């Protein structure tokens, strides 16, 4: 039986320690702002 809803993200170490969860979340978030991979945008509204 699940201890979190199926649609929740997995934010945790591989050990299961929640020690860093806020760093992990912060990282994921700054990453959703500006993904490092991101190729050329085809949008007319462009960061520069």
């Amino acid at each position: 039986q699940r201890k979190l809803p199926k649609h929740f993200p997995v934010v945790q170490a591989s050990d299961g320690s929640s020690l860093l969860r806020e760093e992990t979340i912060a990282c994921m978030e700054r990453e959703r702002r500006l993904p490092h991979n991101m190729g050329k945008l085809y949008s007319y509204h462009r960061p520069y």
């Binding site: 020690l19 806020e22 959703r32 945008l41 949008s43 509204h45 960061p47």
Partner: protein, 168 residues
């Protein structure tokens, strides 16, 4: 109550207030965006998860919490976090006495000079000029409004003109 309404025909559930509340989150990603001073539960609780384990671990003595050695202060003193980055177009093939840095907004003019002295060993800095520029906002191809982090533009005035050369 000159005349009582018929209230017996309603099951008990609270109707939504017609001047409905808008959601508390801030949707405006523009220039004029306001930081919300109001503090919810979640802020303090996430603090409490961040600093010590609040759900599980027992809280440390207050004397520790309020001291320089307490982990978020300890780790900040001995493991600092700043992205102090340089606009290359200032230091590219032109000789320029004034390179231009992007800086986290929580740094002072003094802290930048300390940064450049002790890390990068840049020992001649006449002074620093500081702008606060709101982070770069862009839409992607689905139309998702995104905003890169806010930054501080520091024009850093040196003694010796500095260039970084590009081999063509």
């Amino acid at each position: 109550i000159h005349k009582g309404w018929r209230t017996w025909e309603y099951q008990h559930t609270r109707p939504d207030p017609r001047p409905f509340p808008d959601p508390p989150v801030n949707d405006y990603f523009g220039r004029s965006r306001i930081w919300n001073p109001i503090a919810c539960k979640l802020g303090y609780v996430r603090k409490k998860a961040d600093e010590w384990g609040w759900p599980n671990k027992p809280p440390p003595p207050t004397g520790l919490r309020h001291s320089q050695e307490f982990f978020p202060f300890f780790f900040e003193r001995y493991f600092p976090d700043a992205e102090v980055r340089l606009l290359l177009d200032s230091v590219l093939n032109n000789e320029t006495k004034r390179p231009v840095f992007q800086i986290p907004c929580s740094m002072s003019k003094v802290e930048l000079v300390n940064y450049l002295k002790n890390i990068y060993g840049i020992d001649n800095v006449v002074r620093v000029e500081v702008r606060n520029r709101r982070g770069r906002r862009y839409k992607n191809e689905v139309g998702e409004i995104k905003m890169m982090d806010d930054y501080k533009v520091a024009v850093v005035e040196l003694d010796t003109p500095v260039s970084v050369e590009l081999k063509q």
